[PDB]
């Protein structure tokens, strides 16, 4: 806590899972409305809501790192093997899940929507026939593919990339039968919060297995992503900055997991290594995680114009007095076993 | 809400003080996001004083033309001039602020006026030449200030916690000990993130038996150190506060000029809020050439404590306010625009 900050114990394997929570927790406005939440009713143990205010809580006031198996019990991956079966979207996903849902009818519902969520398109349109399919969608995340991708604006450029379809995977238009078709995807909106996953985890046919991409794939600290929106906005263009970078040092679940963050936004980085918070250079956080057995996983970019409302203050006046009494002894009670 | 994106309020009847104190408490950003925060679904829609704040502060956050108070005087029953000239400018202050106090109870957001606005300190009466003391906790959620013989807030503050002696024709009962000579005084205890000064310009003249405006010069600063008036100081959090507001009138009765002085973000940039007319102003109109001496000068100060600054004047955007409560206001918009 010489950073200001503190960290999350190393309590069994949980790989991906403290970069997670470090991300999250630096999420201010998310943790402000996670205060919020009516959880004074809940179980205890059971209630995944009550053990991410509690990790939260701790995470903002304790000078020691901070446990985590409350947590992992309420949502049930309590061995190695969850890990292993989850991709970390997997874990956000049930996290902010179980949240957006408990804020349902209160003060702060929609929250998680307002914050992580975004707007696509998906359309099939055929070449020589006059038929479309477009469908709406929406994205709390977005997995980007890194093989052959020298950069991040080279994988946006493939994600839009439009796909034929004719030969032996021609589209059935219907009425108009096998028809040649184009395939693809055009970005709508994008969030406050960013959340890309580089795909570096990939099947391999011959081992029957996954293998992890250790290739050099390079992101900017600043990320301009008007050029993939279908109309741009003047007056609030889609500029991002970085904010979390969650690193993997390895080939399998065995490896070493860390995540940079500059958690005010101002380029001021930091290493959260479990219980080990230090301050770091900005390469050693962007640049030294490009790769080509140590890089990035998962970046966490904020939305320019929204800097300063994801990351407000957030102190102990936004924790109600209730929730702070029940954490407060709860703690007493451990402390006592 | 064109030239500074800010947008004024109307000038619809004799309100006095009361436009000055709406921008004041809608700039208090914690506060606003609090007030949206509130469930008023069920509130009668003409009745309820904090439904009516939620309508101010949405339409000085949206609309482009000045906006309206007449729902907001007829839901706390001051129609008349005659209500305001009843009522010090606190007064008026602690109406809005009970009622959506009380509205706040056992929701997410209760105690927040308290943490925003209430101070502690300490009251005392000691007799000197025997062993009796009475102590008296207080809350207080603003501060009268004495300008008259002042010449700046150092020195108000000053004399708000000089020690009174009670002595020859005035001492203190006793009670088992008698009359006995003593000493009384205030200590403050604690100060809030926001601090509201009243300035007790507005004084009882013996001879013309009535109150008169005293427009004697009283100096107060951009930046406020007040740790000297604490009992006990924390050297991780000094007693500093930025100025904020400050609300001023010009001729001497509430048939005067009322306008009210913001820098909105912490940032010692200046706007002038005229009822309906906003406009960038310099540091110097706002402050010091409202020190008086025919000319404005203040009546109410608001400085906000520098370590909560950024917290007070949070970011509040058109996503804190809840989806329910925007349809509410603006099926009641639609309606008022229907005639
Ligand atoms: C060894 C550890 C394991 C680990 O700790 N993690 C956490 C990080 C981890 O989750 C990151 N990661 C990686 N590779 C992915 C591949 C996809 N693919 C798709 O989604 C398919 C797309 N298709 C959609 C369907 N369409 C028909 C066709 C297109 C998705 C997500 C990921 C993904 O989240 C991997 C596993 C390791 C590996 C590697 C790095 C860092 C640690
Ligand atoms: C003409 C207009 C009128 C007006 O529009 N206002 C709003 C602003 C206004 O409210 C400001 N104001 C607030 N509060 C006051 C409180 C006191 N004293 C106390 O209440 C403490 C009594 N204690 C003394 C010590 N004792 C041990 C215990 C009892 C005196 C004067 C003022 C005062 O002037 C005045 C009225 C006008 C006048 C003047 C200026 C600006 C406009």
Same mark, same amino acid.
């Given at each position: 806590?010489?950073?200001?900050?503190?960290?999350?114990?190393?309590?069994? &394997?949980?790989?991906?899972?403290?970069?997670? =929570? /470090?991300?999250?927790?630096?999420?201010?406005?998310?943790? #402000?409305?996670?205060?919020?939440?009516?959880?004074?009713?809940?179980?205890?143990?059971?209630?995944?809501?009550? &053990?991410?205010?509690?990790?939260?809580?701790? =995470? /903002?006031?304790?000078?020691?790192?901070?446990?985590?198996? #409350?947590?992992?019990?309420?949502?049930?991956?309590?061995?190695?093997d969850s890990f292993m079966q989850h991709d970390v979207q997997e874990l956000c996903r049930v996290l902010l899940d179980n949240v957006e849902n408990k804020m349902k009818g209160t003060c702060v519902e929609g929250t998680i929507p307002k914050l992580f969520r975004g707007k696509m398109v998906s359309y099939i349109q055929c070449k020589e026939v006059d038929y479309r399919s477009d469908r709406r969608e929406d994205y709390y995340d977005i997995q980007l593919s890194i093989k052959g991708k020298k950069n991040i604006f080279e994988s946006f450029v493939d994600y839009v990339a439009v796909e034929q379809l004719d030969g032996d995977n021609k589209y059935d238009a219907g009425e108009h039968g096998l028809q040649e078709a184009e395939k693809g995807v055009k970005f709508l909106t994008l969030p406050p919060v960013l959340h890309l996953q580089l795909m570096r985890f990939m099947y391999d046919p011959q081992t029957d297995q996954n293998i992890k991409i250790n290739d050099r794939f390079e992101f900017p600290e600043q990320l301009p992503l008007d050029e993939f929106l279908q109309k741009t906005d003047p007056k609030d263009p889609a500029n991002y900055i970085l904010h979390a970078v969650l690193v993997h040092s390895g080939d399998n679940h065995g490896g070493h997991y860390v995540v940079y963050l500059n958690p005010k936004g101002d380029g001021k980085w930091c290493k959260f290594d479990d219980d080990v918070v230090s301050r770091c250079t900005k390469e050693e956080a962007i640049e030294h995680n490009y790769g080509g057995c140590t890089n990035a996983y998962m970046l966490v970019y904020i939305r320019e114009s929204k800097l300063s409302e994801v990351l407000q203050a957030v102190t102990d006046h936004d924790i109600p007095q209730q929730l702070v009494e029940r954490l407060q002894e709860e703690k007493r009670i451990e402390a006592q076993k």
């Amino acid at each position: 806590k010489h950073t200001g900050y503190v960290g999350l114990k190393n309590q069994g &394997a949980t790989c991906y899972m403290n970069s997670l =929570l /470090q991300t999250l927790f630096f999420t201010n406005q998310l943790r #402000k409305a996670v205060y919020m939440m009516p959880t004074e009713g809940d179980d205890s143990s059971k209630s995944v809501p009550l &053990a991410l205010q509690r990790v939260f809580y701790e =995470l /903002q006031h304790s000078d020691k790192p901070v446990g985590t198996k #409350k947590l992992t019990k309420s949502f049930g991956w309590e061995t190695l093997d969850s890990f292993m079966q989850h991709d970390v979207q997997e874990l956000c996903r049930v996290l902010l899940d179980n949240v957006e849902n408990k804020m349902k009818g209160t003060c702060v519902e929609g929250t998680i929507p307002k914050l992580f969520r975004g707007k696509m398109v998906s359309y099939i349109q055929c070449k020589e026939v006059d038929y479309r399919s477009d469908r709406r969608e929406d994205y709390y995340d977005i997995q980007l593919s890194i093989k052959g991708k020298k950069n991040i604006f080279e994988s946006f450029v493939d994600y839009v990339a439009v796909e034929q379809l004719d030969g032996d995977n021609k589209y059935d238009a219907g009425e108009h039968g096998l028809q040649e078709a184009e395939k693809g995807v055009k970005f709508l909106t994008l969030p406050p919060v960013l959340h890309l996953q580089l795909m570096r985890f990939m099947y391999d046919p011959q081992t029957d297995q996954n293998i992890k991409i250790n290739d050099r794939f390079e992101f900017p600290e600043q990320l301009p992503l008007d050029e993939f929106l279908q109309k741009t906005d003047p007056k609030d263009p889609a500029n991002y900055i970085l904010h979390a970078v969650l690193v993997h040092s390895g080939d399998n679940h065995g490896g070493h997991y860390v995540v940079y963050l500059n958690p005010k936004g101002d380029g001021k980085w930091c290493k959260f290594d479990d219980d080990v918070v230090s301050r770091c250079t900005k390469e050693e956080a962007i640049e030294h995680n490009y790769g080509g057995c140590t890089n990035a996983y998962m970046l966490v970019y904020i939305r320019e114009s929204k800097l300063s409302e994801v990351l407000q203050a957030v102190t102990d006046h936004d924790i109600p007095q209730q929730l702070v009494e029940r954490l407060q002894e709860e703690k007493r009670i451990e402390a006592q076993k």
